[PDB]
Design a protein around this motif. Structure first.
Motif, PDB file in Angstrom:
ATOM      1  N   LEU C  52       0.852  -1.219   0.000  1.00  0.00           N
ATOM      2  CA  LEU C  52       0.000   0.000   0.000  1.00  0.00           C
ATOM      3  C   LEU C  52       0.876   1.255   0.000  1.00  0.00           C
ATOM      4  O   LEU C  52       1.702   1.393   0.921  1.00  0.00           O
ATOM      5  CB  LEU C  52      -0.919  -0.025   1.225  1.00  0.00           C
ATOM      6  CG  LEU C  52      -2.191  -0.861   1.084  1.00  0.00           C
ATOM      7  CD1 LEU C  52      -1.860  -2.337   0.944  1.00  0.00           C
ATOM      8  CD2 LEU C  52      -3.119  -0.636   2.267  1.00  0.00           C
ATOM      9  N   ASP C  53       0.705   2.127  -0.996  1.00  0.00           N
ATOM     10  CA  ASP C  53       1.435   3.382  -1.044  1.00  0.00           C
ATOM     11  C   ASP C  53       1.227   4.149   0.251  1.00  0.00           C
ATOM     12  O   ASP C  53       0.124   4.186   0.801  1.00  0.00           O
ATOM     13  CB  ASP C  53       0.977   4.224  -2.236  1.00  0.00           C
ATOM     14  CG  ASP C  53       1.321   3.587  -3.567  1.00  0.00           C
ATOM     15  OD1 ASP C  53       1.681   2.392  -3.584  1.00  0.00           O
ATOM     16  OD2 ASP C  53       1.241   4.284  -4.599  1.00  0.00           O
ATOM     17  N   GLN C  57      -0.104  12.039   5.708  1.00  0.00           N
ATOM     18  CA  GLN C  57       0.453  13.383   5.696  1.00  0.00           C
ATOM     19  C   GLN C  57       1.106  13.758   7.017  1.00  0.00           C
ATOM     20  O   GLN C  57       1.685  14.844   7.112  1.00  0.00           O
ATOM     21  CB  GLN C  57      -0.627  14.402   5.337  1.00  0.00           C
ATOM     22  CG  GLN C  57      -1.785  14.436   6.295  1.00  0.00           C
ATOM     23  CD  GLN C  57      -2.888  15.351   5.822  1.00  0.00           C
ATOM     24  OE1 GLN C  57      -2.638  16.342   5.142  1.00  0.00           O
ATOM     25  NE2 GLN C  57      -4.122  15.016   6.173  1.00  0.00           N
ATOM     26  N   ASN C  58       1.028  12.902   8.028  1.00  0.00           N
ATOM     27  CA  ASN C  58       1.741  13.114   9.278  1.00  0.00           C
ATOM     28  C   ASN C  58       3.183  12.638   9.220  1.00  0.00           C
ATOM     29  O   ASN C  58       3.912  12.794  10.203  1.00  0.00           O
ATOM     30  CB  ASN C  58       1.018  12.408  10.427  1.00  0.00           C
ATOM     31  CG  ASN C  58      -0.312  13.042  10.748  1.00  0.00           C
ATOM     32  OD1 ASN C  58      -0.467  14.257  10.666  1.00  0.00           O
ATOM     33  ND2 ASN C  58      -1.284  12.220  11.110  1.00  0.00           N
ATOM     34  N   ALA C  59       3.610  12.066   8.100  1.00  0.00           N
ATOM     35  CA  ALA C  59       4.954  11.543   7.939  1.00  0.00           C
ATOM     36  C   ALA C  59       5.757  12.437   7.005  1.00  0.00           C
ATOM     37  O   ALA C  59       5.213  13.046   6.080  1.00  0.00           O
ATOM     38  CB  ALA C  59       4.925  10.116   7.390  1.00  0.00           C
TER      39      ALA C  59
ATOM     40  N   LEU G  12      -7.955  12.510   1.906  1.00  0.00           N
ATOM     41  CA  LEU G  12      -7.118  11.896   0.884  1.00  0.00           C
ATOM     42  C   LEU G  12      -7.032  10.389   1.073  1.00  0.00           C
ATOM     43  O   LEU G  12      -7.094   9.628   0.101  1.00  0.00           O
ATOM     44  CB  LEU G  12      -5.727  12.535   0.923  1.00  0.00           C
ATOM     45  CG  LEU G  12      -4.530  12.084   0.080  1.00  0.00           C
ATOM     46  CD1 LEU G  12      -3.814  10.893   0.687  1.00  0.00           C
ATOM     47  CD2 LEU G  12      -4.937  11.778  -1.327  1.00  0.00           C
ATOM     48  N   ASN G  13      -6.883   9.938   2.315  1.00  0.00           N
ATOM     49  CA  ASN G  13      -6.748   8.522   2.624  1.00  0.00           C
ATOM     50  C   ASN G  13      -7.894   8.031   3.501  1.00  0.00           C
ATOM     51  O   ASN G  13      -7.708   7.162   4.351  1.00  0.00           O
ATOM     52  CB  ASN G  13      -5.405   8.245   3.293  1.00  0.00           C
ATOM     53  CG  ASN G  13      -5.012   6.788   3.226  1.00  0.00           C
ATOM     54  OD1 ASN G  13      -5.332   6.090   2.265  1.00  0.00           O
ATOM     55  ND2 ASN G  13      -4.323   6.316   4.256  1.00  0.00           N
ATOM     56  N   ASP G  14      -9.087   8.590   3.311  1.00  0.00           N
ATOM     57  CA  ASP G  14     -10.279   8.198   4.062  1.00  0.00           C
ATOM     58  C   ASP G  14     -11.394   7.945   3.061  1.00  0.00           C
ATOM     59  O   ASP G  14     -12.175   8.851   2.748  1.00  0.00           O
ATOM     60  CB  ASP G  14     -10.669   9.269   5.076  1.00  0.00           C
ATOM     61  CG  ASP G  14     -11.638   8.760   6.117  1.00  0.00           C
ATOM     62  OD1 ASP G  14     -12.193   7.659   5.931  1.00  0.00           O
ATOM     63  OD2 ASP G  14     -11.838   9.457   7.132  1.00  0.00           O
ATOM     64  N   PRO G  15     -11.498   6.724   2.532  1.00  0.00           N
ATOM     65  CA  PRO G  15     -12.499   6.464   1.487  1.00  0.00           C
ATOM     66  C   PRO G  15     -13.922   6.742   1.926  1.00  0.00           C
ATOM     67  O   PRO G  15     -14.746   7.166   1.110  1.00  0.00           O
ATOM     68  CB  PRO G  15     -12.285   4.980   1.168  1.00  0.00           C
ATOM     69  CG  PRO G  15     -10.927   4.669   1.666  1.00  0.00           C
ATOM     70  CD  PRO G  15     -10.728   5.519   2.865  1.00  0.00           C
ATOM     71  N   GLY G  16     -14.237   6.514   3.200  1.00  0.00           N
ATOM     72  CA  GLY G  16     -15.584   6.776   3.672  1.00  0.00           C
ATOM     73  C   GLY G  16     -15.947   8.244   3.605  1.00  0.00           C
ATOM     74  O   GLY G  16     -17.028   8.608   3.140  1.00  0.00           O
ATOM     75  N   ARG G  17     -15.046   9.109   4.062  1.00  0.00           N
ATOM     76  CA  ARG G  17     -15.324  10.537   4.044  1.00  0.00           C
ATOM     77  C   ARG G  17     -15.004  11.181   2.708  1.00  0.00           C
ATOM     78  O   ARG G  17     -15.472  12.291   2.446  1.00  0.00           O
ATOM     79  CB  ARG G  17     -14.560  11.229   5.167  1.00  0.00           C
ATOM     80  CG  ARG G  17     -15.041  10.794   6.525  1.00  0.00           C
ATOM     81  CD  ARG G  17     -14.566  11.701   7.617  1.00  0.00           C
ATOM     82  NE  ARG G  17     -15.365  11.526   8.820  1.00  0.00           N
ATOM     83  CZ  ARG G  17     -15.161  12.177   9.955  1.00  0.00           C
ATOM     84  NH1 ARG G  17     -14.171  13.040  10.087  1.00  0.00           N
ATOM     85  NH2 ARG G  17     -15.971  11.956  10.982  1.00  0.00           N
TER      86      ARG G  17
END
Ligand code: CHL
Ligand code: CHL
Ligand code: CHL
Ligand code: CLA
Ligand code: CLA
Ligand code: CLA
Ligand code: CLA
Ligand SMILES: CCCCCCCCCCCCCCCCCC(=O)OC[C@H](CO[C@@H]1O[C@H](CO)[C@H](O)[C@H](O)[C@H]1O)OC(=O)CCCCCCCCCCCCCCCCC
Ligand SMILES: CCCCCCCCCCCCCCCC(=O)OC[C@H](CO[C@@H]1O[C@H](CS(=O)(=O)O)[C@@H](O)[C@H](O)[C@H]1O)OC(=O)CCCCCCCCCCCCCCC
Ligand SMILES: CC1=C[C@H](O)CC(C)(C)[C@H]1/C=C/C(C)=C/C=C/C(C)=C/C=C/C=C(C)/C=C/C=C(C)/C=C/C1=C(C)C[C@H](O)CC1(C)C
Lengths: 60, 221, 236, 37, 34, 67, 51
Positions: C52-53, C57-59, G12-17
């Motif tokens: 998984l890429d 954004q916390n990194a 960006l990384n929350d498919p549900g929202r």
């Protein structure tokens, strides 16, 4: 006349049944809801943890 | 409640001095009514029980089937060739034949012999399976010849044996009422010449005036 | 009686070419296996799993995923997933079910196109529009408007195909038997069953090619099945 | 019913492919002739 | 308009039937008391 | 941690399962390049027709073709 | 602290929202279409289709 209307207002019809289709609508819907109610009566009462005998019922 | 010695009986409080010994209450619809002793023979009692339920199931279909077209033609837009049950057979001799729901595109039967040939084939096979107890390739082998269940109970309404006993009483009691009412359908058709639904609406128009005694009793003799 | 008189009884495995080898994935056990897979569509597929890429954004650094391993998934495994029952798309047994279903539809269609053309005199392509405007069968006008039939066709075929998808055994998905084999012609594991199944794929593949012929001929000549036949005879 | 303008459009597409093929061919040749490692 | 009336009659009957058989479903027992 | 399970979620779950699975190597890239080239030529042709740099006998390419 | 131009990167990384956020733009765009049509119908004069 100029236009067409139901012309049932102020005519004293039983339940406002100007045509028999209204009778079927009321009867069919009621029978369906009573049907699903009828098959569930035993389960609904079982929750009371009591048999629906002559002494059954919220009494004071 | 419906089985055993404390079951309800047909003469109410006076039904104790005529309840037969062999009517014990192990079968649905047992009200202790065998005043003619027609079921004294246990084997004959078994067959009569089959005939009663078969006559009852046919009457339940008959009663609904004899009045449903008349209800539809009167209280709906459906226009049958002949709604009245004792005139419905003559529809097949009409010009358009017999049209289901009055629609020329449904069934549209036009030969009485073809209908009869199909019936004696279809009913003949089905009645044979019931009589023999097994259908084609032993479809119903090992099932009760009066209460087959299985394929004939797709909704499984009789899976609980205790619910079966209660529901059997409902079947025979609705069936007996249907048998009695079909007797009314037969006699009322003969005496009145109108459909059973037409007879009911006549009683409701004026019950004191439109009944058997005020309309037809004087004519029967 | 013997024979070897008017025929050459050569010994070999009947393949799609006079001399060639069966692909390793095409054993020959399945009915109709002729070693025909030049594109290797039924070859057991190999896939690589990428990780998984990183998208946090916390990194400070979010590196894309790399190959985490090579796996060959096991095909021809049906599961309870209604939408995707088979484990892999490219499986031999899933394709055989596709081959049989495509083939059985073509057999009905090839016969259906011919019969209605010989009964009604209308091309099978022109038949669709005619029934749309006037629902009718064998010349008799049906007692249902087209709108209801449209919904009924989708609902009836919807239920029918949902029943079909309930089966989990891959072989029984291609050969349900039971109520669909009332005569018990090929319900056993006999050689007659194998031969009957061999006949079915041949008639099925014939019908798939044949109905492909109907559509292309209708596109090009503009005629139906029987119509195209008459056009060719007159062409001489 | 191919007009002369249509023929030149087809000819231009083919000529464009030849230019791309000539570019790719030359690059692949030099890349192979002058290879790293 | 008749289609409208039948639709309304079906809707009114449905909700009233729910109301009637809702309270006939051992409602007095639907309480947190002991 | 498994997340909220819903009847629609379990139904659609197979469609969101093969996240990282890829075909090794270049896969069907050359086949994709063929379709892009055909698409590029198709885009050029319709561009020339609208630009009138290609003249077809049947097409008129003006408002008068509304007739 | 997150810059003001990266606020909507939380989905960006929350498919549900992400679906919820894309459902909101869809709600607004259809809301605009309905609002715009009703306004135009309140101002449009259909009496003279030619001039
Ligand atoms: C199975 C029971 C059955 C019964 C009770 C009747 C009854 C009747 N059919 Mg009928 N049919 C039956 C089956 C069938 N019919 C037909 C085909 C026809 C045609 C084509 C016609 C009739 C007609 C009639 C009526 C004749 C008028 C009459 O006699 O009026 C006076 C009598 C009554 C109103 C009372 C009827 C009660 C009946 C006499 C006694 C009830 C018990 C029976 C003896 C049941 C016997 C069952 C046996 C045979 C298995 C009549 C009410 C005629 C009609 O409709 O006339 C307009 C007609 O033309 N039937 C077929 C298909 C071939 C049947 C198949 O099962
Ligand atoms: C093999 C084919 C076969 C077919 C097509 C029928 C068809 C029928 N059977 Mg039947 N039966 C068949 C085999 C058999 N039956 C019976 C025993 C009975 C009985 C006891 C009865 C029927 C009845 C019926 C009728 C109504 C049943 C019904 O609606 O049930 C399904 C119910 C809801 C969908 C119906 C036309 C009934 C009848 O005659 O009604 C008047 C009835 O009472 N069958 C046996 C022996 C167990 C069979 C085979 O072994
Ligand atoms: C064995 C008894 C008995 C017999 C054989 C007859 C025979 C006859 N009665 Mg009759 N009746 C009988 C009892 C009774 N009748 C009547 C009241 C009438 C009237 C008002 C008329 C007749 C008429 C007739 C004749 C015409 C047929 C008819 O329409 O019947 C009608 C039959 C009834 C109205 C009675 C129904 C059955 C009776 C109540 C059965 C009694 C036993 C139990 C109470 C039943 C339990 C279930 C006919 C010859 C008609 C006549 O005379 O035509 C010129 C006529 O108009 N009866 C009553 C009082 C309600 C009776 C009571 O038992
Ligand atoms: C959609 C129809 C269809 C499908 C799903 C299959 C599926 C299958 N075929 Mg079959 N076949 C078909 C049609 C089909 N066939 C037709 C019409 C013919 C007659 C020419 C044949 C003749 C044939 C032979 C002789 C053999 C097979 C074999 C096979 C099996 C292995 C080959 C394979 O996996 O390729 C998968 C196939 C597809 C994915 C179909 C897609 C192909 C493209 C998209 C169509 C091309 C356009 C077309 C030319 C127009 C497989 C189960 C072999 C076998 O029996 O294995 C046991 C074998 O020996 N087929
Ligand atoms: C995949 C199979 C298939 C499909 C989708 C169709 C579809 C159709 N058929 Mg058809 N048919 C088939 C198989 C099939 N048929 C077969 C195997 C036969 C031989 C028995 C026939 C013989 C046949 C005839 C004789 C006629 C049709 C007609 C029709 C058309 C409307 C009638 C109808 O279906 O109402 C439901 C039927 C019940 C319709 C497009 C009718 C038509 O008018 O076409 C224009 C028509 O007359 N079919
Ligand atoms: C479907 C199109 C689309 C989508 C989904 C996104 C999505 C995204 N963009 Mg982006 N962008 C787009 C088009 C799009 N962009 C275009 C066309 C441009 C060129 C102008 C840019 C230039 C751009 C830049 C420079 C940056 C982003 C950034 C971002 C990310 C954070 C956005 C944010 O929180 O800012 C928040 C925005 C506000 C708080 C206020 C917006 C007010 C603007 C200035 C005007 C108001 C517009 C009005 C209300 C609606 C009209 C829109 C409609 C007419 C199209 C985000 C995932 C940022 C990023 O990469 O994060 C790391 C970032 O730096 N975008
Ligand atoms: C049942 C759903 C539905 C229906 C029937 C309609 C119907 C209508 N809408 Mg509406 N709309 C909907 C949903 C719907 N909408 C939703 C969910 C939204 C929120 C996004 C909107 C937002 C919206 C706006 C803002 C507007 C309308 C407008 C309109 C009217 C004119 C539509 C038109 O001509 O534009 C034409 C539509 C297109 C040109 C779509 C083009 C498709 C692009 C080019 C896709 C190409 C890329 C594609 C992926 C390629 C790959 C696929 C291919 C390979 C096969 C029309 C009556 C307009 C209107 O009249 O205002 C009232 C108007 O401005 N709608
Ligand atoms: C039966 C009544 C028993 C006694 C009730 C005593 C209480 C109130 C009595 C008020 C009048 C009752 C009349 C009932 C019949 C009637 O209303 O017909 C129904 C009437 C008649 O409807 C109209 O009749 C007209 C006759 O010319 C026309 O035909 C019109 O087209 C038609 O719409 O319409 C209504 O009043 C709508 C009733 C909708 C149901 C309301 C339920 C509210 C909740 C109930 C919870 C129940 C538990
Ligand atoms: C010239 C070519 C013409 C071709 C035309 C193509 C379309 C023809 C019309 C459709 C024919 C198929 C009828 C349905 C067969 C079937 O599976 O159901 C019959 C089987 C009975 O055997 C049951 O079968 C079950 C599964 S199976 O059917 O054996 O696979 C089994 O588990 C169970 O033990 C057994 O009791 O029932 C089931 O499979 C379960 C569903 C029961 C409900 C049936 C639908 C109602 C009748 C529809 C009739 C339509 C005609
Ligand atoms: C218990 C006892 C005891 C002691 O001991 C002795 C004694 C007294 C003897 C006994 C009693 C008995 C009795 C009462 C009997 C009765 C019976 C009946 C009535 C039946 C019916 C029965 C009846 C029945 C089945 C019926 C059936 C019917 C049907 C199917 C119908 C058909 C139809 C339809 C739908 C419709 C059309 O349009 C017409 C028709 C075609 C017609």
């Amino acid at each position: 006349l100029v236009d067409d209307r139901l012309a049932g207002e102020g005519t004293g019809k039983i339940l406002g049944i100007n045509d028999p289709s209204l009778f079927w609508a009321i009867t069919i819907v009621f029978t369906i809801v009573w049907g699903v109610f009828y098959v569930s009566t035993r389960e609904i009462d079982a929750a009371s943890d009591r048999e629906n005998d002559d002494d059954f019922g919220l009494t004071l | 409640v419906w089985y055993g010695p404390d079951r309800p009986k047909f003469l109410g409080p006076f039904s104790d001095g005529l309840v037969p010994a062999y009517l014990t209450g192990e079968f649905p619809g047992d009200y202790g009514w065998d005043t003619s002793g027609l079921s004294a023979d246990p084997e004959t009692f078994k067959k009569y029980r089959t005939i009663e339920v078969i006559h009852a199931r046919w009457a339940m279909l008959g009663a609904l089937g004899c009045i449903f077209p008349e209800v539809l033609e009167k209280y709906s837009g459906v226009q049958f060739g002949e709604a009245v049950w004792f005139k419905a057979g003559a529809q097949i001799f009409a010009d358009g034949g017999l049209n289901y729901l009055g629609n020329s595109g449904l069934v549209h039967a036009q030969s009485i012999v073809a209908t009869l040939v199909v019936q004696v084939l279809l009913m003949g096979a089905v009645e044979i399976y019931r009589a023999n107890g097994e259908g084609p390739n032993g479809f119903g082998e090992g099932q009760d010849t009066l209460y087959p269940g299985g394929a004939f109970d797709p909704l499984g309404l009789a899976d609980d044996p205790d619910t079966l006993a209660e529901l059997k009483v409902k079947e025979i009691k609705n069936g007996r009422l249907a048998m009695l009412s079909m007797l009314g359908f037969f006699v009322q058709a003969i005496v009145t010449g109108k459909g059973p639904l037409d007879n009911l609406l006549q009683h409701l128009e004026e019950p004191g005036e439109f009944n058997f005694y005020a309309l037809y009793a004087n004519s029967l003799a | 009686r013997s024979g070897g008189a008017g025929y050459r009884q050569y010994s070999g495995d009947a393949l799609w070419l006079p001399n060639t080898e069966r692909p390793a994935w095409l054993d020959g056990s399945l009915p109709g296996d002729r070693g025909f897979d030049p594109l290797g569509l039924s070859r057991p597929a190999e896939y690589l799993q990428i990780d998984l890429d990183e998208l946090d954004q916390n990194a400070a650094v979010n590196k894309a995923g790399g190959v985490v391993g090579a796996f060959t998934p096991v095909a021809d495994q049906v599961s309870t997933d209604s939408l995707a029952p088979y484990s892999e798309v490219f499986g031999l047994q899933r394709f055989r079910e596709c081959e049989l279903i495509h083939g059985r539809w073509a057999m009905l269609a090839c016969l259906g196109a011919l019969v209605q053309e010989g009964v009604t005199g209308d091309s099978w392509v022109a038949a669709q529009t005619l029934v749309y405007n006037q629902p009718q069968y064998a010349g008799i006008d049906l007692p249902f408007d087209i709108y209801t039939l449209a919904v009924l066709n989708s609902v009836l075929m919807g239920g029918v195909e949902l029943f079909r998808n309930s089966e989990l055994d891959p072989e029984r998905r291609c050969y349900p038997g039971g109520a669909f084999d009332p005569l018990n012609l090929a319900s056993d594991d006999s050689e007659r069953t194998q031969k009957l199944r061999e006949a079915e794929i041949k008639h099925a593949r014939l019908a798939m090619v044949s109905f492909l012929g109907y559509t292309v001929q209708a596109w090009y000549t503009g005629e139906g099945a029987l119509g195209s036949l008459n056009k060719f005879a007159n062409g001489f | 019913a191919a007009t002369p303008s249509l023929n030149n459009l087809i000819g231009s597409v083919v000529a464009g492919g030849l230019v791309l093929a000539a570019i790719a061919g030359a690059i692949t040749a030099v890349s192979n002739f002058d290879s790293i490692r | 308009m008749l289609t409208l009336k039948i639709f309304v009659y079906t809707v009114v009957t449905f909700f009233v039937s729910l109301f009637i058989f809702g309270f006939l479903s051992n409602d007095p027992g639907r309480n947190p008391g002991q | 941690d498994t997340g909220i399970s819903t009847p629609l979620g379990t139904l659609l779950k197979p469609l969101n399962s093969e996240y990282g699975k890829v075909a090794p190597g270049w896969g069907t890239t050359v086949l994709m390049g063929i379709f892009m080239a055909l698409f590029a030529v198709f885009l050029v042709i319709i561009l020339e027709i609208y630009n009138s740099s290609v003249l077809l006998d049947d097409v008129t390419m003006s408002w008068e073709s509304l007739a | 602290g997150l810059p003001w131009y990266r606020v909507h990167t939380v989905v960006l990384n929350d498919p549900g929202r992400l679906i919820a956020v894309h459902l909101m733009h869809t709600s607004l765009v259809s809301g605009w279409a309905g609002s715009m049509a009703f306004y135009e119908l309140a101002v449009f004069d259909p009496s003279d289709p030619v001039l």
